[PDB]
């Protein structure tokens, strides 16, 4: 069937904005997963998981009688798709059970692991999500094998369709770099926002870069990809050596024996894949990666034997039975148990990437310290395993259950507790009037609140106006936030705040975070008044102010908006057309196409553009909340053409006279070009739409202001 | 960005079931278009449309000073995509404004027509939809040019994204037949459900079949494609001759001058396309089809000149200025006016397909009768224009406004008005108990009501249980309806009905259409009781019984279900996999993925399969409403394989013993294979889900029983 995507492959795709509809969700509109989870008997689930670990099924027999290592890999892969650039991937939505991830080559045979969990999932039903169950299982695995975890939080609600993620442009699974769709260029520079080295890999190639078994060059790729998943050297070493304390790899025969991945397999496979014609196809004969390595002398028990082997032997390059490069210990005895035959033992083996931890000089220093001090290694691994599995969950307020760690960690972008009465509706009215009497303008008020709130991204639930981090490094200095204007506004609001808080009794006070949002509410209200319309913008207090000491400046850099079409802003020149970047921002903000449309049309006429650019400001009553952007854009009296100086800026001229009326970017004019976006523009630019435009603008403004308010969930 | 569609192009696409969500719609959830339209000042809209006709814009100057022809073509094309096979296409959703239809080659320059209507759309806003406006404009154009229309109904609500329609498999616009994706095979057999001869045409090629200018062979294509749009010979000749009484075609220079269609055009084109480098690119120099034909001596006035020209000259094959085949009158004088230069006249000309109306012997007879009796031609064209523009609107109860014709037309599948008190709740309980005491089984009750209600399709709003047409030809004889079983059920229900009606006072009676539905409801109630659940199934009376004389047997044939996965039925062997057909059926029933899932799993255990097939009947308590279908399907204790005899039938065997437990089709097992459908199955197969399953089944059952109830809204 030929589709629109076939005929017009470069046209913008709005369907990413309309996933997660109430249509595709099997649970009722009123289902609240947190309420369900909070009544789960978590202890009972963990005792069923503990039993499962040593209850082998004959369709996928357990290595060493224990599924622990399989399930640790499962959980690590669930979390391991995470990219800090955009916050997409990670374990937080249980996406490993849908396409494409369920059929990526590096997820081979995790179909079996997830099928092992069905009886448990079935037993507890809606009170435990697949998303949470995958993580919990990896925890129970670690526990069952003698490792003390840092804790666990529930609350990852299940999703019901594949997430729209750009995973790369390659058309071949695992394609080596330098192809027609190479994710690499320059001196091995991996393209943003990707955080893996080949399409269908979690981080790096276990044989070495593009299959070259050089541990020193492989370390480079490990360091770069882990940093793109927000893990530093200590965390990286802890995680790789920690995971590879357990279990084994599977490469018992040639890979050509392995059949279709789950999405490609026959209907009779009933959602499983990688069916193997090599001997029994499973157990002793399993093939997953094609490597055949077992790291430790007790693969089903926590130990410090990974580093004892790493540092106590010298290593020789060898090949698995599938032909993959791997390493064996020179002159070693057979000390490693076999997974099924108790009369057989094997020499220690390592992946190229394991040896990276000894042959890269910075990793070597950490690895030696972990070898000499295995209590340090155990604590680093527990903390890193927690971060790995929780990094995309969002603020601590979303953490459910009896095992949440009490320690507040810097990577959580923590927000202090509120310990005082909040402002009431009369206070909020009084503050709005004080803000408007200060002489701050609509443009200043709307721009500041937009800058504070529009850092949120729903992909990992970071960002938002909670915290008042807009006043702190690095946000206060970002170009899009207009640092000198911003500083002036914040000084005036901090004076308003000091005066209001000094006059109270009873401990009542207002945070700057709340007052920034409220002040933006007053700007929207005043703009509505400027247009002849009395509206109240909703406001919910209870945000708190974080300190600089509670803010990791390097982790916050990924939240900088380098492209924000809501402020007509592009920090530099990109490959990707600015309209595509706008739809990507809308998706991160959780906006639909109609919400994106209303919000951008209003923000243009409110003066929200960076630098006071006139691009898209299609009004003669700036700072009034009207639908002029739509009326003017859709006026066929005006003809548009790209400028000679810059093809991405357009002049709108009177069609009859030639007189210059306006200028606009691609982000402005897409609303008059794309057939679906123009239909939306037509609704708001109709003669009956002023009241609708105002109400829908207020609604979407308030939505953006509240994106991070999981305290009100 | 490589997508799931790229990796697994044969995997099933459920996003067709979740279009048209409240996310994509700019209107609020309780916007009711009918209510808005009923308040529109339709008379005012019409006066503005009359004014527009002759208000020429310089960017697309009006031929002959009057846009009437262009607008008639616009409305004709809006309606002309309609296929009787599935009911998809047509004017009823305004889809000419979205991809792909806004950019189909035969829709060239209709972008201009729609842009000429924007000021009126803007002025009346949500009170008139694009969908209604495109049809009303066509009507006004006719009226302005002297033709009295048969009527007009409003009520076509706008839609907000492209409809999912299979338009063909060709990857080249306009590709002639016999290519790798040919819509033709055998002796020119067009593939169902297509109703046009080339990709991007409305019906046929105006030069003749595959470009060969043979009017007799073109006639064959015209007859076949019009029949596939629900039009017979008389309607066909009236429509082509009526349309071509007006306006002109455009082909003033070579087609290579024409640039990108609207979805391919630059952002500066602001939604328009087909920009032409030939001379002024418009007006006298316009290029649309490449033909240059003006049919009549008065192209802006209703006349009887079409048939006078057709029969009064003999015709010679010639070429337009773009190179296209067309026909010129032998030895004629220059009598046809020029569209822009009063000093120029032209000889009469005709398309190949216009000469079909003279040279095909059966059309010749009609055409001559129209020529000799022009009052007949006028009345047939008025009726056929009404039908063309309203054929996809559904029952008359949906028709809005003050111009709706009072005459009831057979193609509307009319239902008689109800003239008597309806049954109340006490009566319904009395009838359900009578039905259950008669000895009809759960299987029979459920099967019969499903058979009656599941003929509905949302595409053109035909079908459904209202009318009791299940008792009439041809529905009573369809193989999927199990004609001998059906007859026995209807005899028993008609005796119940006669007894109940004979005991009433005050004119109260029940229709058989109501009783069939109510009896289905009693079957579902009984099946819940069989499972230990006390459940009441909602029922709304008020359906009426249509007569055989109100039921066009040939038009009803397109509703026959040749594939109904809900009854595990497939009439023969198809090239499309049966699970794709199930999703296509779900779409026509307006079901989402979770509704399709719950429905099919319940129908399987209630005994709704055709012929009592055991395929998918995964329960040991048939006729009890339980979630057994899901629990058993997802059991990993069972292994599935295709049979040797038939690859589309699967045996499910105990994994440990090899013993046969079940058999299923592709429709059954897809719910265990597709990763999104399996996620839905898991919800209903969980230990906490029996009550959910029952309540969701009742809801979707009710939904299906009321799909055609436009008398209740
Ligand atoms: C540079 C990073 C990493 C690479 C290249 C890598 C590579 C691999 C490969 C190739 C396998 C074998 C798959 C199979 O054939 O069955 C595997 C297994 C495994 N990995 Fe990793 N790994 C990395 C990091 C991690 C991390 C961060 C953890 C968890 C903290 C983890 C835990 C495991 C475990 C537990 C297994 C054993 C599975 C089993 O027993 O079935 N690895 N690793
Ligand atoms: C066999 C079926 C038909 C064929 C092949 C056909 C073909 C076409 C073609 C090629 C053009 C020229 C487009 C352009 O160059 O501007 C056209 C024009 C037009 N057709 Fe048809 N037509 C068919 C049926 C219809 C029907 C059923 C109607 C309406 C009832 C219709 C009404 C018109 C009108 C009014 C024009 C003139 C447009 C203008 O003045 O701009 N035609 N036709
Ligand atoms: Na994420
Ligand atoms: Na339709």
UniProtKB/Swiss-Prot annotation, chains A, B:
It catalyses: H2O2 + AH2 = A + 2 H2O; 2 H2O2 = O2 + 2 H2O. The active site is at residue 77. Its EC number is 1.11.1.21. There is a cross-link at residues 76-203 (Tryptophyl-tyrosyl-methioninium (Trp-Tyr) (with M-244)). InterPro entries: Catalase_peroxidase, Haem_peroxidase, Haem_peroxidase_sf, Peroxidases_AS, Peroxidases_heam-ligand_BS. Binds 1 heme b (iron(II)-protoporphyrin IX) group per dimer. The record marks 73 as: Transition state stabilizer. There is a cross-link at residues 203-229 (Tryptophyl-tyrosyl-methioninium (Tyr-Met) (with W-91)). Keywords: Heme, Hydrogen peroxide, Iron, Metal-binding, Oxidoreductase, Peroxidase. Bifunctional enzyme with both catalase and broad-spectrum peroxidase activity. This is Catalase-peroxidase. The keyword NADP does not apply. It is an enzyme of class 1 (oxidoreductase). One of its GO terms (molecular function) is metal ion binding. One of its GO terms (cellular component) is cytosol. Belongs to the peroxidase family. Peroxidase/catalase subfamily. NCBIfam families: cat_per_HPI, PRK15061.1. Formation of the three residue Trp-Tyr-Met cross-link is important for the catalase, but not the peroxidase activity of the enzyme. Heme b binds at residue 244. Its cofactor is heme b. The lineage of its organism: Bacteria, Pseudomonadati, Pseudomonadota, Betaproteobacteria, Burkholderiales. One of its GO terms (biological process) is cellular response to hydrogen peroxide. Homodimer or homotetramer. It comes from Burkholderia pseudomallei (strain 1710b). Coiled coil: none annotated.
